[PDB]
């Protein structure tokens, strides 16, 4: 009695259609008996039949500026239905593929937060943070902060609680981030967070003592900044570590010919800022650990203490500097998250 129905996610002649999601066709009062979708070349799309016939829907990526064309017959008791739609997607004036840290499967310290960097600025952050997904498990309250105009943050009020577990699903593809700018690809990460490390350097004592789920478990007599050149204040998120590297102040904006410049060769280094604060080896200053303070900014201590560090402090431990005469370390250093007051941080500043 009734003549089937079509009916498509997409409709005849239009443009703009956004590749952020698959293309479909349902039946009513009928079955699907043909669903073909074609580009501009004439090649077909990959796509799936539910099997009780009522629906199709494409099941790979479709492209950017692409023309397609949708073919579908519905059959049913009461006759037979068949449609032919063709749009056009989204045309993009540029492409943004994001870098998610940390990596896949990895476990981090409690201080670390997730990073989202994209390779373009973005016009419209909002978008961008629209189209990420945080999980977490036990679930915390967080909230995006951007440090500059291509990388946004993720944290919560506080240190991750040990054993939560984290997902990133950065799902861009086919969203526009502004000014005709789409996102290149969708990325999807998982970590994990291990045991609580938080290490403290008092310049009252010349003591780095790093704390494992607060107990001490070592004791590092430490040469920082000298006054001229001191260690900020605040907290520090550990980043990657290194055996051995040269550390070149050009890489940090001073040049080595400079009266501040520097370029050395260090062993068992561990980053703590963007600003370019290690904790090193420093045999030439282990006469001073303990006592005075003579680096360019480094946290310089011995040898062995050094490669204990190494060995035991992951990316996304934490370095809490206490006493110096210097300032606070800048929030959007880049390890410096955690110095931004949380009514701040949470508020954000997409706009
Ligand atoms: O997503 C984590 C972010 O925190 C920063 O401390 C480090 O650069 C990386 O671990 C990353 O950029
Ligand atoms: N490092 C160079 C200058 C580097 C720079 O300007 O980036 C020098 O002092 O010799």
Redesign the pocket.
Known sequence: LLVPKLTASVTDGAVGVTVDAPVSVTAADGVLAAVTMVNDNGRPVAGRLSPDGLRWSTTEQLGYNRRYTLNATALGLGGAATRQLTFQTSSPAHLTMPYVMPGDGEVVGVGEPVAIRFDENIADRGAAEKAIKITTNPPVEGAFYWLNNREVRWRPEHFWKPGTAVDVAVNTYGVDLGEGMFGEDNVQTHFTIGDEVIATADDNTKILTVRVNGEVVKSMPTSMGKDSTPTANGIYIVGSRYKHIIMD??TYGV????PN?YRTDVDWATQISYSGVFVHSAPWSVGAQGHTNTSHGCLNVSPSNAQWFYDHVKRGDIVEVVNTVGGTLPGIDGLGDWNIPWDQWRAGNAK
């Open positions: 102040s050009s040049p080595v010919n400079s410049g």
